[PDB]
Amino acid sequence: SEDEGSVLGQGGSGTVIYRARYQGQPVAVKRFHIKKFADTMLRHLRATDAMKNFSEFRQEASMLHALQHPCIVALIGISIHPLCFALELAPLSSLNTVLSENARDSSFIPLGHMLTQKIAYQIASGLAYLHKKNIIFCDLKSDNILVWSLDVKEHINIKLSDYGIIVYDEKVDMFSYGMVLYELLSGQRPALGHHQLQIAKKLSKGIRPVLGQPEEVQFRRLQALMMECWDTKPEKRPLALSVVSQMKDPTFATFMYELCCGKQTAFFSSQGQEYTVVFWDGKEESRNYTVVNTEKGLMEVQRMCCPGMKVSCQLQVQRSLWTATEDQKIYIYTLKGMCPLNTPQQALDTPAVVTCFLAVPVIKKNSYLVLAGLADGLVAVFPVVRGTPKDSCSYLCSHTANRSKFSIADEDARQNPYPVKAMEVVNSGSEVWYSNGPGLLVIDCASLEICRRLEPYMAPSMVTSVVCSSEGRGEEVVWCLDDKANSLVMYHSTTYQLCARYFCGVPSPLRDMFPVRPFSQHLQAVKILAVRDLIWVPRRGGDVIVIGLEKDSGAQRGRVIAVLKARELTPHGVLVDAAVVAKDTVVCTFENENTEWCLAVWRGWGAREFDIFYQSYEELGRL
Amino acid sequence: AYVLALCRSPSGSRATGFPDITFKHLHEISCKSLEGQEGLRQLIFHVTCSMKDCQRLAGRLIPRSYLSLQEAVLAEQQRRSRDDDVQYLTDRQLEQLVEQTPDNDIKDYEDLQSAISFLIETGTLLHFPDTSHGLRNLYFLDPIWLSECLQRIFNIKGSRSVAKNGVIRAEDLRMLLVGTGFTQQTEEQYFQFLAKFEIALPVANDSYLLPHLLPSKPGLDTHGMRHPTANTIQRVFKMSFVPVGFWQRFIARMLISLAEMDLQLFTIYSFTGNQRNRCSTFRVKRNQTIYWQEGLLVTFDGGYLSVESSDVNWKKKKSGGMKIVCQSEVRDFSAMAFITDHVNSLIDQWFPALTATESDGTPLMEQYVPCPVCETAWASEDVQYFDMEDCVLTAIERDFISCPRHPDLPVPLQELVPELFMTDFPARLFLENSKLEHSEDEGSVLGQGGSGTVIYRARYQGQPVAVKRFHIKKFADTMLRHLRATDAMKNFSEFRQEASMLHALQHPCIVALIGISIHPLCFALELAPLSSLNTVLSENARDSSFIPLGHMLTQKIAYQIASGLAYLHKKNIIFCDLKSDNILVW
């Protein structure tokens, strides 16, 4: 159909691409219109134009038939009467269309994080394929990048056409790729003006439509690739094939940005109602804190005064922040005072300094129990009703439990008053597991008596982290991390039986894997971070190894899905801590020789997202 | 007033399904003092003389030939009564009495037909209009003789050595019944008659089943045949009353239907949009059968179905009723739809009065389905259940109905009433709604069938398709919900029947089936590019004398039509509506 409403686009040849149907398939038919209204000159001009159009026909047919890639619009056939040929028709129209539609209602990354990365990868792959074929685009733009799927699990989402809806080289196409990246990330055109000569002069003078910062775009690696792509010196601009290689790095996939607060004294991570990523500085009169909100990359609270003693942790309990100070006291403030919580609402005494916390919810009571892991291996139980703390404690003695049930020798090294470090809830909060030295102790949340002892490690070892996760089959499973051994061990929660070991001190975790029955410091583990159905294990070297389980005849094979490290985090020193701040966000905190702390935030991906990433690369490699 | 409250609508009009009863149809009498008997006599005379036929019924003008035939048949009845003869007037014998009539103006059959109507509505002739297999060709003279014969057959309480679980050999029945006929010259008529009344149904080529002689519940393990499987569907019927002989006739009908299915799986059929029905959706190979006066179990390859009388007391509404449970490891629950159609057919034929409600709109029968979620929660008690009317009303719109006792625990309909979701046929034959560019526009109408359903032009997977969609709704009220559920159930029965007959056939000259869908209830056939044979035939007929299509083309079209008819006849499928409009061109 030649109707004006059937017009799908126009090319630079003066030819028109219409919407049509071929064999019931929706097709984009480029037709050539040659006639321009007995005369000799008319016949001559007509034959000349027809000859030129036929030359263009042959050239386009040759270049279309010669190419086959996943991200190029394929050719259906070629016809003589009329002189036209059919290409695949994009169901979703151009990249520009949907990009504008999603740009209207967002700030950055209108298409979504994973989708934006995949589209950038596909464009880079197409450009690399053309460059391998020694084919130069010279007119790369959002109007001629056509869309076929807006899904993230789908293999192909876009293809590049020869039509839209002086000296050229791969660096020019990469400059245009940088502009396409700008449009992808921002959703807005590079509006440097209305006159293209002045836009070109501005671009040549290094002027660019600068967007926000990594805290705001939250996809810093793409921003670095972008800025490197439009470098005013073409010799420095990347190669498209190099970009295709780079995109396969999971660090690009998951790292968002980093934020530095300068000098502090300690770091803690909370649930995120407030003090989401808190750093503590000062002491006594000058004691203060700085809070980072990871979803915005902002410091709404900066060195806000909070007088008192040095704190090891601060448990947020439905409104009330329980500051474990070194004076064997928990100072309980509340959010009613907003940020400057200088006056505590309660002060609860302990026989030893509180080293860690846990808040186990009793749903049958609609209440909480704050279990404070003390400096001597004993557990202080403080009931909580609607954020109101109680002074009537229950102190649980590890030594009494050992004398009662576990019967460890009084001469054993396990008798040391080792401080409680790790605390976790298992069995829908029916039991609380906490680490004491090489061992672990399980408190019954109904009677609050220390019910079980597990031995993930043997003396003189020490467990520093304990986190519970559940496989997709409903098997609830608990990791236990050790400092001396530099290894983690996995138990079944419903049997209290050791079932796997994962050694972390691996200099080269090349597809590192271990079974599951039915520079030396740089490899030292930091913390267990249970994210969705995977476990992130940060290490002192700045790299975090993410592991999942593969099913094998009922048994499991724990295996790394990806190794993650943003090299740009090197100046901030050794990785000290880490946390899971949201279901789809993870943080890891470095400290340097100046005691200056930095926060590096990663997309809290699970098995689904890592699998989609790696599977996309493997599958597109196979196409 | 009470007897009107039992028969009148709350509005004061006649309630649905009930006669037109008023104060003018009420009376009371005594037999000793004869109080009010004169009043009743006067009322009878008033209503009879007030009876309009057309003129008034009492004294209406009727041909003297019809009256002469009336006296003739009365004389024939008297003759046979004197002769101790059998009271069947065959079609030939009635025609002979017509021929013997003096001054007979009856010359073609329709005049006789009107006369027959007269003879029936004056109590002269008795008729059972069963047109199947020519069984209609018989008329009755004496109600007393009829009742006597039916009581004589009912009277035969043969021992288990005689009644082999309710069946007696044909020769034994023929011998036992001699005294009021049942000779070799009348055996065929008598067995035709008993089959019409469903008194002695044929059994193999050996015996006849007498439904009042069904055995008691045999000492067999009917519970050990049950499986602890998730592929379990249950239905429960509650009934205000149980008709006498309900279970006997009901069970006998399933028995004979299973027998004929077993025979065919090794003769009334239908094609095209037609009122005629058949259990073509039932294709099951039986393995064992147990049956008794008040129930039956059938065990087939892949599962079983049980029906049994039960003390149904949902919502403390204890009354008559029954339970049905069907299990099938292949998700084939066509046996339950088979039983559903049998329930409907039995009630419509023999207890159609039960297809109604109370004077206030309360159904005489109700159907419920035990709730899988509530049963799982309990697993007795008044466990929850879903009204069948709500089930069907929800299946047509939504994949889901909420559970009353567990509002936030989903019950799937397909795990509730799979017969309304087609768990029988392979999934490959499903029609994808996302791939169908269906349109209901008046310009998209490709045709209409006899089912009241509309065939539209649409696109499926880019292919031009003829999608037959069913339109069920006809604009809080109880009667509305009831009528709606009934129509949806009937439309789903037609859906299953058409799907079965379409999937079962593959010939060059039959329109093939692309797939079948539930939401909306519709299915796709191939769409003819050249429209109907009638269209192009008229177009080419305008400009020719004979053979508009061309010699060879005309011969080929005739051959193709003959081939299609031959294929259908080999399949024992009858067209009955062959015409140019439904022969489509490609």
Curated annotation (Swiss-Prot), chain B:
Q: Where does GDP bind?
A: 31-32
Subunit structure of this chain's protein: Homodimer. The homodimer is autoinhibited and stabilized by its N-terminal residues and ANK repeats. Interacts with CSK.
SS bond list: none
Q: Which disorder is it connected to?
A: Osteosclerotic metaphyseal dysplasia: An autosomal recessive skeletal dysplasia characterized by osteosclerosis at multiple skeletal sites, predominantly at the metaphyses of the long bones and vertebral bodies.
Q: Which residues of the full protein are shown?
A: 776 to 1395 of 2015
Q: Which residues carry this modification: Phosphoserine?
A: 270, 280
The record's function comment reads: Serine/threonine-protein kinase which phosphorylates RAB proteins involved in intracellular trafficking. Phosphorylates RAB7A; this activity is dependent on protein kinase C (PKC) activation. Plays a role in the negative regulation of bone mass, acting through the maturation of osteoclasts.
Q: How is it modified after translation?
A: Autophosphorylated. Autophosphorylation is inhibited in its dimeric state. Phosphorylated by protein kinase C isozymes PRKCA, PRKCB, PRKCG, PRKCE, PRKCZ and PRKCT at Thr-267, Ser-270, Ser-280 and Thr-281. Phosphorylation at these Ser-270, Ser-280 and Thr-281 activates the kinase activity of LRRK1 to phosphorylate RAB7A.
Please tell me, according to the UniProt entry, what happens when changing residue 280 to E.
Phosphomimetic mutant which increases phosphorylation of RAB7A by 2 fold when activated by phorbol ester. Phosphomimetic mutant which increases phosphorylation of RAB7A by 2 fold
The identity of this protein, by name, is: Leucine-rich repeat serine/threonine-protein kinase 1
Family, similarity comment? Belongs to the protein kinase superfamily. TKL Ser/Thr protein kinase family. ROCO subfamily.
What happens when you mutate residue 190 to F?
A: Increases RAB7A phosphorylation, likely by blocking EGF-mediated inactivation
Catalytic residues at: 577
Q: What is the effect of changing residue 267 to A?
A: Slightly increases phosphorylation of RAB7A
Residue numbers of Phosphothreonine PTMs? 267, 281
Result of changing residue 280 to A: Inhibits phosphorylation activity and blocks activation by phorbol ester
| Outcome when changing residue 281 to E | Phosphomimetic mutant which abolishes phosphorylation of RAB7A and blocks activation by phorbol ester. Increases phosphorylation of RAB7A by 2-6 fold
- Record annotation: effect of changing residue 468 to M: Abolishes phosphorylation of RAB7A
Could you tell me where this protein is found in the cell? Answer: Cytoplasm; Cell membrane
- The entry marks the following residues as binding ATP, namely 446-454, 468
Q: List, for all copies, the residue spans of the domain called COR.
A: 63-255
Q: Which organism is it from?
A: Homo sapiens
